Amino acid sequence: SMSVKKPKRDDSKDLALCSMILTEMETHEDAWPFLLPVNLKLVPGYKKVIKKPMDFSTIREKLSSGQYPNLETFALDVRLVFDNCETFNEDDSDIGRAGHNMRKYFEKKWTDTFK
């Protein structure tokens, strides 16, 4: 509360560390469905159904331009990529499996880097 604060966590490396995680997601072999924004002209139903499209390139641009206020807002966008994927893709499809694999990969890197 006012004049009452928990001890200051060192957040000075968060930006660099989120960049590294994102590099690792970008270079994963199952990243291909997530590298670029879904083409809303060419994929029927995507625009109407997925209210907040997100992809790795868009996260990278937001990261690089100071549009994440903190590491939680960064994690929210990553998870949004996988949540969108589950919304639109059957579990039993290449893309559906890709999204589950990437989500796992991400959550482990996240826990190991920050928890």
Swiss-Prot record:
Expressed at varying levels in several tissues, whereas a smaller transcript was expressed specifically in testis. Residues 9-113 form the Bromo domain. It is found in: Nucleus. Regulatory subunit of the ATP-dependent BRF-1 and BRF-5 ISWI chromatin remodeling complexes, which form ordered nucleosome arrays on chromatin and facilitate access to DNA during DNA-templated processes such as DNA replication, transcription, and repair. Both complexes regulate the spacing of nucleosomes along the chromatin and have the ability to slide mononucleosomes to the center of a DNA template. The BRF-1 ISWI chromatin remodeling complex has a lower ATP hydrolysis rate than the BRF-5 ISWI chromatin remodeling complex. Component of the BRF-1 ISWI chromatin remodeling complex, at least composed of SMARCA1 and BAZ2B, which regulates the spacing of histone octamers on the DNA template to facilitate access to DNA. Within the BRF-1 ISWI chromatin remodeling complex interacts with SMARCA1; the interaction is direct. Component of the BRF-5 ISWI chromatin remodeling complex, at least composed of SMARCA5/SNF2H and BAZ2B, which regulates the spacing of histone octamers on the DNA template to facilitate access to DNA. Belongs to the WAL family. This is Bromodomain adjacent to zinc finger domain protein 2B.
